[PDB]
Amino acid sequence: LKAGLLGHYQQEAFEARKRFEESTTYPGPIRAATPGDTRFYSGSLESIL
Amino acid sequence: TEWKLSPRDIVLRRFGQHTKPPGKAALDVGSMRGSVIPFGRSPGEQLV
């Protein structure tokens, strides 16, 4: 992709994010669910052992 | 009111829709046969 349009996009990445935190109202802290396991480890294939 | 436009006649260019090509705006690498130096090969040339 065109890299020269990156930094202005960063301004949009600022100007949306600051728009987000002032738009919505956070009701409360949602409890943290436990993370599962990913099947996309790097490297070669492991064994079933 | 109505839009009777059909995109098939736009894409397939019915009624002979002609777009004028740009003037030598190809900009490919295979046709270039010269080494590009900053300020060119001869930067300041005076016609006397």
Binding site: L1, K2, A3, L6, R39, F40, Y41, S42, G43, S44, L45 | P7, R8, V11, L12, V29, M32, G34, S35, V36
Partner: protein
């Protein structure tokens, strides 16, 4: 004195092989091309070889090289080259496999310019959420299939119009009317009645017979 990198490479070659390089490798040899086939009868359909073709991947002219300075190196801090990529979803005809077109930069030092080439990858999405038109961020992983070693790490921008067209029961992207042809011969569309197809077949087979008559040459 500050020695260059070629001194270090020569030191590596000396410590590996015992010596740097045997001399007299140029020899100014006259490489002559001797043709055998007829004038326009080379045994190939696309590329007809009639001169000395150079052999080499990275040591040919005009010289290319990978250009590591692009959008991906500016955004992602990568453990190795090609680990994280950002591209667009172009095909979802396969199950759990999104076709992602990504771009990279190749540098020409003779013309001093970088060009954007395109590589297509097969990525993996388990829940089938990638729609054609999504700006996605894919990452390297293990071998999943014969051509799947990437997976969709994040959907940076979803195609809203594609999802709304899929809600309407239509295709996500309307299919293109142009594409790849089937031959170099001009594919003429035949529009005839149900009774006038035999004479059209006779004209087509006669045209094929004349194309076979072109083997005879003169007279």
């Amino acid at each position: 004195p500050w020695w260059n990198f070629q001194t270090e490479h020569r030191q590596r070659c000396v410590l590996m092989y015992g010596g740097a390089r045997t001399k007299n490798t140029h020899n100014a040899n006259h490489r002559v091309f001797i043709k055998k086939y007829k004038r326009n009868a080379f045994p190939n359909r696309t590329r007809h070889h009639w001169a000395v073709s150079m052999t080499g991947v990275l040591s040919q002219r005009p010289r290319r090289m990978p250009w590591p300075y692009d959008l991906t190196s500016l955004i992602f801090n990568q453990p190795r080259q090609g680990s994280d990529k950002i591209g667009y979803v172009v095909g979802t005809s396969m199950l759990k496999t999104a076709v992602v077109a990504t771009n990279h930069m190749v540098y020409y030092p003779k013309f001093n310019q970088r060009v954007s080439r395109t590589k297509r990858f097969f990525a993996h999405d388990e829940d089938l959420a990638c729609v054609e038109g999504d700006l996605v961020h894919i990452k390297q992983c293990r071998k999943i299939s014969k051509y799947k070693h990437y997976y969709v790490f994040s959907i940076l921008e979803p195609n809203v119009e594609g999802r709304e067209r899929l809600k309407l029961g239509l295709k996500a992207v309307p299919p293109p009317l142009f594409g790849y042809p089937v031959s170099r011969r001009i594919v003429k569309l035949n529009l005839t009645s149900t009774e006038g197809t035999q004479e059209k077949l006779a004209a087509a087979i006669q045209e094929h017979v004349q194309d076979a008559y072109r083997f005879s040459g003169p007279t």
